[PDB]
Structure formats: structure tokens, C-alpha cells
Amino acid sequence: CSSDSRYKRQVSGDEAYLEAAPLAELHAPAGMILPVTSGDYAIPVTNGSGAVGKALDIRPPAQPLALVSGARTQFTGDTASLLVENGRGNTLWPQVVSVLQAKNYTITQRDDAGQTLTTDWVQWNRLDEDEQYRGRYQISVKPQGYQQAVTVKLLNLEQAGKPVA
């Protein structure tokens, strides 16, 4: 709303929790054993994971829309889940072909023998984030019978030309 330039992917205020120094653990002398483990400070120590502070996205996590009826909407890993319960095991494949060209996607390879395809990078973005992107996807329709699973696999996230790893 009203802010001093930006604030789409960051935390408010400073990064005090990163800025602050490590703690000077106490080393009591022999025989002086105090019950200093009586608190609730169950803090595990490791290098996991992600970025920190502003570098750490506080983005509302991904989950796609019900683009198709009955879609199992949920992005996980690199895949946007959109599984569909129809009536025959060859309905999503032609639906996908229609959708691909409804979206005007450029296709690298077409598995017409099966029901899958490899696409190139298509540019997309949203001003609710401080960056712009491109996505390369592997589409896989999985004829389970009346239901066909729909795998929308982000083969590569490219930040408006910068292949994100």
C-alpha cells in the first residue's frame, strides 16, 4: 500500500535476528554443575536451509488454480499438480494440446505416441514480487483410467533470462 519503495519479498524492519551476535556459552568450573538445561530452548544446530532475511522469500507458497475440473491443485518440488478424474484414459492429452495452444506455448518435443511433451521457456511475472520470471516445463499426462494424472514439471526457472538453479 503506502511504503518507502518496494517491500514485496522481504521482512519488515531490520534483520535483527541475523544482525545479532552468537552467544557466549558458559563454562562453569569443575563441580559447578547447574540445571541450565531446564528451559524450553530446544534449538537444533545445522546448516539448513534456504536464504535469510530479505533474501528469504516470505512469498505465499505456490499452489495453482483449478484450471481444469477436479484438478488436484498443489505445486510441490517443481511440479504443479492438477490431476483430473474424467471417464477415459485419453481425454487430458487432447485437453492439454488445446490448453497449450490456448496459452500459446512453444513446444520443444511432442510425445504424441504417449501423452507427454517438452516445452521451452515462457516468460511470466507478477508485481506482488520484486522479480520477473520464465519457465520451462515437462508436461506429463498419466492415463490411470478414468483419471489421468497431470504433471506440470518446471524443468527450469529462469529469472527473465537468468536460469535459476
Next chain:
Amino acid sequence: ERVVYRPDINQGNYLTANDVSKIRVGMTQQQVAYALGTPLMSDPFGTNTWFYVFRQQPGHEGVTQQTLTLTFNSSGVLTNIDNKPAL
């Protein structure tokens, strides 16, 4: 300094002479606890000693005091009733 008014400072956490007579060395922490419960202080890393000290300042006229501690051994058995008074 040369001041008459002073908010009194109190405290608590102490045993009366009656409470002292209620117990004796050899009694366990629980035997004591059965009517004297617990102090609001022990020995952070030593033993089972209980600290029942009374303090209270009377408007710039020094401070009153009865420091009583009860040293119990590792089995919770009272070994020493240190009924220290003021100073």
C-alpha cells in the same frame, strides 16, 4: 542519607521459631516439606540445601534479618540447620 522517609522493604520465605522446632537434622526434605513445604531458593549446583531467609528494612533504621538455611545431603537428608540471625 539524612532522610526520615523510606518505603519499607520486606521479603518472607522464612521459618519461625516454631517452624524451627518442627524439624531436626536427620529429617528428609520431604519430612521437612510436610509442613514447611519448600524455600524459594536452593543451591544451584551443590546439594539439596534449602534457603529460608527473612529480610526487612524499617525506614532507614538498618535492616532486620533471619537467615536460615537447611543443608541436606544427596539423599535429601538434613545434615545442618543453619539458623543464622541478622548480620
Next chain:
Amino acid sequence: EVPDNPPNEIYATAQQKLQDGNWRQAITQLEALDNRYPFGPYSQQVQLDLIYAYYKNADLPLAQAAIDRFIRLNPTHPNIDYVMYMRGLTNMALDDSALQGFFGVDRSDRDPQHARAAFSDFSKLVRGYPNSQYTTDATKRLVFLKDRLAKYEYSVAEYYTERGAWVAVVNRVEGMLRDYPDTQATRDALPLMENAYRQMQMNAQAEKVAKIIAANSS
């Protein structure tokens, strides 16, 4: 005020308001969306969007509520790491956010109510999600927060030190120790305890502390 459109369209409209950055408007659509289509497949996402937008719009009580719902609506879910993180983040910010920091005026002397809540939140995150994408940051938060918590309690001990409540001083220092043996405030609290012991004619006990200080004399 929100027109009824397809839930995908309403959602997209909310995204457009998020594009604007007008969190208030985005939220308006998101809420309307779950109020028009509460059964939408991505109503969970709407709640995530709301958690985000509420944070962005300083509506931390509502971010908190959205999280509570997410938890109850999705006891197990791939995006909980976020939700848990945000719970802590929300509560953290809820605890400390006054503009007084601008003027160099500290808040560690305010009771870390939501900060303690956040402590728990983040500790759940880092334990339950040992290496999630939010865990490093959360871990750091747990460390610093502990120090803040200590500063508060330390300040409390200082109050009693000033007051002359030597018993309280010792117990407050001891409380810090029992919680954790590590903050600088803990190192500083340590001699406050000793002082109190001398003030209580517990010199021997004071000496015990002095020995600890000697071991920690660096």
C-alpha cells in the same frame, strides 16, 4: 463490494491487487473468494495469500488467525514449513514493531509475549523441518530471540538489584541460567547474583559464583 466471478478469476483479481501492492484490496478479494467459494481447491492458497498479505498489511492478528486455520484445515501439508515460519514471524513482529527503534530506543525491556510464542513457533519449525527453506533464518531467530529474552529478564534482575530484593535477584539470575547458560546477559547476570549473595551475608555462596565468573572471565 466484491463482484462474484469464477473463483479462479476472483483469485486472479486478488493477485492483480497484490500486483498493485494494495494488500487491503488483495485481502478484500481473497476473503471474498473464500466467502463465495470456501470449498475451492486452492482455498488453502487463499489462506496462504492472506497470511502473506496480512503480514504485508500489518494485520498480524489476522495473519495469526489465518495460520491457525491453515493448521486446522491442513494438519499435514508441504507448505507448513512456511506457515510455521510465518507464525513465528507474525508473532515476532506482533511482539516488536514500535517506531521507537528509529530513535535508538530499545524494546528488550518490553515483555516478549509474542516473541516467546514465536520462539516456540520457530523452534517447532527448525525441529519439525530440520532443513527447510525457512529453517536457517528461523534458527538465527531463535538465537537472537533468546538473547532478547535474556535482556528482558536481565533488566528485571537489575530492577530487583536496584530495589534491594536480593532474593529475587538471585532467583531471576538463576532463572536465566536454568533457561540457558549462554547469552551475554547471562554472563552479566552471573555477578548480579554474586552481589546479592554478599548482600545476604551469603559470601560463601558469593564465592561459588565468583569461581564461576573466573571460569567464564572472557
Next chain:
Amino acid sequence: FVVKDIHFEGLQRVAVGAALLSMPVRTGDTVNDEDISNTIRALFATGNFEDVRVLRDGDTLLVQVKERPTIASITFSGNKSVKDDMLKQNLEASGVRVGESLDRTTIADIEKGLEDFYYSVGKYSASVKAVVTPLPRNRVDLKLVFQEGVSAEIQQINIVGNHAFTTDELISHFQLRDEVPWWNVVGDRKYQKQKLAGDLETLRSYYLDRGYARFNIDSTQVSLTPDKKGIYVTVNITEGDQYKLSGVEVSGNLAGHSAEIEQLTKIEPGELYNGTKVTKMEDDIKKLLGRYGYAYPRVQSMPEINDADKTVKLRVNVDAGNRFYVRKIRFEGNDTSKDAVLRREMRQMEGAWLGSDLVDQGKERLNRLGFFETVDTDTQRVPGSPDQVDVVYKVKERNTGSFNFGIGYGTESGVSFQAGVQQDNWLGTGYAVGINGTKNDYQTYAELSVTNPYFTVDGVSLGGRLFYNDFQADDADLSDYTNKSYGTDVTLGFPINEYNSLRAGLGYVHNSLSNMQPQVAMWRYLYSMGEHPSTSDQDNSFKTDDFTFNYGWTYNKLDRGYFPTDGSRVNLTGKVTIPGSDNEYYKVTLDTATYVPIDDDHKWVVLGRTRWGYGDGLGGKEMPFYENFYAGGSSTVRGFQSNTIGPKAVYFPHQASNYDPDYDYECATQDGAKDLCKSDDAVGGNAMAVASLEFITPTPFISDKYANSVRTSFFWDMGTVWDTNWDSSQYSGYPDYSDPSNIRMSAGIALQWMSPLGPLVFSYAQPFKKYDGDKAEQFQFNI
């Protein structure tokens, strides 16, 4: 058959798989004709399917389901003062809300519930109607009509079984209202069984405290009169008879304080039994023991009633418990301010015996603090020990500080403005701040004022005030009374008692006057000063540097530190000059703030406010005319204009000011208005005696939630300012302000609004008692 597959029609709110699971006949599961029926009703049992038509193509099932969801909205119309949500809560209680299915066959039940709601409300003549509007897919808008016909009314309480008291006198003590005179509107005649319940107990206590140990209530039947409104009441009681308290048989763990308990139970044998006295005494003992450390002192009286003579031996069982529960304390809601500020206000301390009085005392102090809105706590016993209770002082913090200013006339004149803002516990640091000023083309003024109420532990209220009044009456620079006034004012507040505090410090005043006005008050002062100013000229200057001693004392046993309702404060403050000044004089004043709640719940409160003062010389000297007493416009006085109350300056036959715009600013001057032209310039007096009669009233429009920060008040205000050195023989053609009989008077209403910048009091007053030279204004607006 065996279902081949299922044509999942009629879903929307229900998922394909959810329907599959709901069905007895899921794909691959054998299908009997009875199972088709079972499936039909199983799908109906989901509560989301308006219709279910399970069929099949040979053996391939298909089900022509019609969905009955989804409640998209709910509309409330005609509900009047009833909160739609309340109505919705009952709707929700029946499982109906936005996102739920709409089972239309339950509408009648819903409607019943809504009419039952009205029934419980004290209404009943009301009827409701659900209206269903369809939305895309299946969705509905549940519009609800609330035909509120008319509420019930209390008509007449009939008490039978009584023998000694008037039915009506008992009614006069009841919450219920079976008659409300226009000349005695003490409520509305509306029936509530909750009021009844209270009244039954009121009744019980009515007799209880009159000796009726055997008083009881048999039963009651409220009259339901044919018209949904005639509320009459049948009360069946047993008076019992006035038994006399013949003694008390207190025992149990009396903690060795049985003597104090005996004192608490000093009753009279043959005294009419008084169960509220008993109640009181039980609690008195609890409090007694609370003082003695006993957080949990069970007390249980037992009226050993003797029906053979109608007396009673109040046995009392007591279990005092432990003495030392005070472990540690906490505070809550202190997130806007340093916790130590609150800690220092607790008399109760940690590692201690319970001093329940100290707890309350600390809360009183916190109540008087003024940086909080509400005071509360939480004596939470720590599990596992009778020596461990933690007390969390959960309070509601208050926004403090306040910016305000006056302005105009400017734009086409020399740019000007006023400054002035309080922080009052600046950012929770504990510092009281009130800094102000004003830059004008007449004068420029600065003032600093900051106090550290607890510079050290004891309450060293380190208060410093600085000021700089570049006042020149700048219509040129001088000639119209230049008077720069600047200096120092630093004092210390002292801890004297729980309610007592002193003030002491020093003042520094350096004034620089030049070409002062031809007037009696001014000149008279200067003649007291040994100066010899001209009655016809403004060619006199005057520089002075005074050193003074400031002091005072306050009493403070009054509720909230920002809007109290019960107690009183006294504010003694005065000064006396010291050697080194250019004039030996004094000025001593005192303010009083008394609150006497009219209503026992403090809804209405008597406010007494007065101000007193007097200043004069210490021997051949005199308090300066610019230090006089002034009243009107603001401060405490309203109805009359700003500082227009008090003695008025009399000008002398002026001829040369060293600047006098051709006819303008006449001060008894050359250009018109010649001779001793007395002015309307309320120069002020050397004596003060004012009073204010204000009465707190409640606002029936603002939700209590924050109406309790708002204060309206009725008032009758009056007072006087006068000059005891007003030599009426020299003022022979003028008023006589040596006489205290100069009391001005106004009356009306005060309107305190607690804005983001604190309480802003606006008011209306009718300045009735007006004197010559007074100015007035019925509508005044203050901070």
C-alpha cells in the same frame, strides 16, 4: 449387478472422490437394487445433495444428483437493534452458515429458532421468514426477514407468602420494572428472566440481612399473558421469621490470628441475623489472612440455627493454608513501556509472604500511574507447591501524550504558529514530557519541560523546565510594553508517603521590559519597586533578574491517573523569592480534585475542583502584576473568555508612547480616549478563590468498550480573582477588587473526548454572573 463405473453428476461442493466414498456402490463394488436405494439415501445423507437419482446403464451407474449448497451469503433484514450476528449464531448452531449446504427442509426449524431467540430476548411478537436466492452453480443467499412485532412488558410482580414487607417496597429494590414514571425514569419495563433471577436473590438477601435466617423462596411462576406482553409474576416464598444471631463458633486453622478473627466477629448476641454481615466477615477473615500471607484461606460459615427460640450460632470453619506463596511476578500488556516502571510500583515483592494488601496497593499505584488504561492481574498458583504462586499483572496500556495549538491571524500577516506536545512517558522511557512554544510576529516563545519521576529508585522526580519568551508586544518592537521573559525552573519531587509527595527547587527569571504601558497596576507595582514611571508615557523600561525558591506538596489517593472516579488529590504549590532577586515576594497556591462517586458503580460522580492562592511582598515589596491570578476561557474556567476574570488595568492620561499609529491601540492616549481610561484588560489579582461543581455522566450512545475513556459532565462553576491591594480611594471612579465579592458564575456541560492525542474537553456554559469588563463565550473548546 456390479457397478462398471460411476457417472458422477451433481457435485460442486462435493468432490468426485468424496461422492465415490459416500456411495455404498463405489466403482468395482457389487450393486444390488437395494444398494441403489441405499446409495440414494447415502448421498442424501451427505447433506449436500438436494436430489439424488441413482440409475444405471445395464450395470454402469450414473447418478443424476442435484446439489443443495452452497450458502454464498446470508442477509438480515428487519432485525432492528438485534445484532445480525446473534441471529446468525443460532443459524450457525443449526449447522447453517456461508459455505454450508442449504437444507431447505430445516428452514422452518431455523425460523422457529429465530422466533425462540426473540422469545428469550424478552420479545416474542415477532416472526421470521427465510428467502432463498439462487447463485451460479447451486449457491444461495439466505435472506432473513425479521418481523419484530413488539417486545414484552413488565406489568406487575405479585409476591405471596410474605408477611412483613410491602410487595412494592421489595419491587423498588428489584432490577425488574413493573412501572416507570416519567418523573422517575430509572429503567425500561422489559422482562428478562435474568433480572428475575437477580431479583429472587435480591429478595433473598433482603430478608437475609433482616434476621430471616429461615427465609427462603418456594417457587415462582412468571405470568405469560395472552398477548405476548403482559408480564406479571407469581412469587411464592416462605418468610421464615427474624432469627437473631446469638453467636459465632469460628474454628479450624485460624493461623494463630484467631484474636483478629474474634475482632472481626465481634457481633451482638440477640442481633438480628445478618447473612450479608456474615458474608462480609467471612471475606474479612480471608483478607485478614491474605495480609498474613494466606493466599488460600478457606472460610465457611454455618448458621447453627436454633428454631426453639429463633436464634443462631454462626459456626465458621477456617483453613488458612500456607503463608509464603509469593514466588515471582509478571506483567502483561506492557509492550509499550519499560517493565521496570511497573515493577517499581508494586509494594508486593518476590520471595515473600503474601501481602494481599500490598498487591492491591501496588495496583492502586499502577492505577494512579496514568500510562495505562486498565489494571488487572492473575494470581496463578504454580502447580506442585503451596509456597509458589506467580502473579501476572495483565493490564491494558494507554496511549499518552498530546499535541495541540492555536493559530491566526496569519497569511497576509507575519507568519505565525503555536507549538505544544506532551509525550507523557516518552516512548515508554519513563520520562514525562510537555514541550511547547509559539512563533509569532508579536512574540516568540519556547518552553521545555521534562521529568524523570524515578531518577533513582526512591522516586527522584527530576523535573526540569526551561523557558524563553521573546515577548516584545511587537507592533514595532517596543512602546506597547516590551517584556522578554526567560529563565530556569528546576524542581524535585519527593517520596513522602503512599499518597504524599513534596516539591522543591529553584527559579531563575530574567525579564527585559521596555517602553511599558501607562497604567495603574503596572505603575503601582513599579512604584512598589521604588521606580517612578510616567502616567502619560510609555517611555519607561525595566530589566530584572530574580532568583526564587519553588515548592509544593501533593496528596494523591484518587483512582485512575487519566480519568479517575473515586478519591481525592491535593496540590499545594507555591513559591517565595530568595536573596539575590530584585524583589522579595511570594505566591502560594493550592488545587483540589475530589471525586465522590454518586452511583455505587461510579457511573455518576461528584466532582469538586477548587483553586486557591495569594501572593504579595515579603516586606516593603510586592508580587509583580504580571504574576497575578487570571481566569476564564481555559484551564478550569469556562463560560467566560480567556483570562478575562480578575481586576482590570486602568490606564492613565497618556500622551506619548514613542509609537502610536494615528488613532489605534488607544491606551488612554492622545489620539482619542483621553484621561484615565480604564480598560477591560483583566490584569489579574493577587488573590484566588475558585470552585467547580462538575458531575460525571454516562454516554448512552458510545459503546461502553471505549465510552469509559470518554467523560461528559454537568456543571455549575463559579469563582473569583481580586486584588487585595486595590486601593479603592485611588480607584474611586472604578470597581473595587479589594473585595472578595467578585464571584463570576456559569453552568452547563463538559465533553471529554479521548482522541489519539488524549482527552479533549469541549464545553457549553452560560456565564450568568457577569461583572463590568467581563467578556464571555458560551461555546468553548479545550484540550
Next chain:
Amino acid sequence: LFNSEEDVVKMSPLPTVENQFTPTTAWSTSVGSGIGNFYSNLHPALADNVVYAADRAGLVKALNADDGKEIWSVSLAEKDGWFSKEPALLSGGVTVSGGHVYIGSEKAQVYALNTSDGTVAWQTKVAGEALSRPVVSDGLVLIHTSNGQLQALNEADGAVKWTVNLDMPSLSLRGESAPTTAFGAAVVGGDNGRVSAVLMEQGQMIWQQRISQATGSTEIDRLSDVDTTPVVVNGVVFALAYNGNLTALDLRSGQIMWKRELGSVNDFIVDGNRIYLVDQNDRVMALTIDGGVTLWTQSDLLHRLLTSPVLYNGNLVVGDSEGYLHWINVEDGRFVAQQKVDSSGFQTEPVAADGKLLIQAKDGTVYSITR
């Protein structure tokens, strides 16, 4: 403000005013309030040209039914107590038997006055005030109180013979549950929806039968003014449930012969095989006694605040709280005469007895009506 906020339902008014038998009043010797707006069972009685009239707060009148001449007057206002002249505040209707006039008060008192002058033959306190007019017969004063008690007193002094707990509802659901007699048994409804027969001779329950629903969880018509006083006809009892549901049952078994459990009928009389009644909606209807079969109905006075129906001079008579009197053709079924005798308003029972028609308004109280 609030006058416009209240959604008050309008009543049907009064179609076809008649005067086929041009109605009038024999006399309007009112006496004064009376009932006022205080809902009460107090209602007039009439016999041997003695108008047994009384106001609620005080006076007891004997008026001469040749004109409305005060034969005598006394008052049940108790000269002292907790205030001054502790007003009569009568709770039950006027019952007359032998040389006594019987009235129950709101002070739980039962008075018996000398019909020739008004002398308190006796007065005795009972267990609470009455919702019903006392039924005096066979040495007993049969009483139904607001606190659900059945009491029998000695009609000669008031000695309590017994007190029995009856069909008590959630609160004081207004309605007259007066015990009627038949073959030694007392028959009475109940304000909670049951009905019973109780040995009149000793207060010994014969049988009790639940008929319908009452207020509390099944909250009914708090507006409705029914009639839990049964009309025993031969071996079948015809009565309304507290909620106005009509039922016929075996006098000696409680078995339901038939019922119209379907709406809160307010008032009713059983004219052989024509049960005349005033519906919940104050609609006039005649029903058979072999099942409530509609013979005829009239909604002209729908929602008008009608009294009970009585028969007089061959017409169906009913008045209202508006002050209007109506005469309906006993068969089908419409106006024959109509007379607004006042505006004071009637609620008490019309007394088509002693060859007369005595009615009592709120303040205009006593009127003798004719045509």
C-alpha cells in the same frame, strides 16, 4: 420513534354490521374499573336478579337486574396490611352458591360473602392465587392456582380438604384450568398440555392424559388466550389443551375419542354437536363432536380480541376488548346483530344467564345487554 419501529399486526375489523335484532343495552350501570389492563380471571355472575359484580381492587356489588340498581355493596379491600386498605386484588371469577359469593384473590384469599348484604361469611387463605374461578359444589370449593395446585375447601368455612400438585408448565402459562364435576370426579385440563380426572371426593387422581405441547422448548402462542376448563358431556370430555388443541376423550379413561391437534383455539362451548369456538386467529367456527368437522366459519372478526362464545336468545354471542358486541347466526354463520356498547373493552365472561346477558368491561365493567 419506537412507535414506528414496532411491527404491529392489523386485525380484521368488522364486516357487515347488523341489527336484524337491533341490539342495545338493557342498562349500562358500569360501577367502574374493574379489570383495567390487568389480565384476570375475575368475571361477573348473575342469578335471581342479583348482579354479582365486583371490581378487582375493591368493591363488591349486588345490582338489581331490573335496571342495575345497587342492591348492596361491600369491599374486599383489607383495611390494613403493608400499605393502606390492601385492595381486594381479586384473582378468580365470581362463583355463587347457597347464600355465599365465592371469590379467590391475588393474596391467596378465598372469600365467601353473604349474598343478601355482602357480609364476609368467611375468608380463608390458600396455597397461592388462582388462575381459575373456584367451583363450589358438594361441600367443596374446587380451586386451581397459578402455582399448579388443586385445592378443595370447605365451602362453609374454607377448611382445607386437600392440595394436589397438578400439570405444572415452565412458568405461569395463563389459562383457566377450572375443575368441573361429573359422577364424583373432578375434570380439569392443565397449562402444560395434559388433562386429568381426579376423584373430586378425595382429590384422588383417576387418570391423566397428555394432549398437546406447551411453552418451553416447544414455545407456543403466548398471544393465545385458551380455556383449560373442560366441557364434560356425558361420558366424553370435550376440552382444549393448554395450546388450544381440541380433544375429546373418555371421561373415565382419558382415551382420545378424537382431536383437532392443529392450532391454538382460544375459546369454546359445546352446543350438543356444534362446538362453537374462537380460533387462535379469533375466527369463529362450529365443529361436530364426532371429530372436529367444520360446520361453518367466519373470519370477519379475524384477530379481534374476542371473549368466549355464549348462546343467548337464539344467537351466538361474543364481545371483544374493543367494546363491540356481536350476534352470529348459530348455523351459517354470519351477523344477525352487532353493537358497540362501549370502547372500554371486554375480556371477562359473558353471562347469558338468569334470562339475561351480563358482561363486564375493563372500566365500563357492568352492562346488561338485550335487543
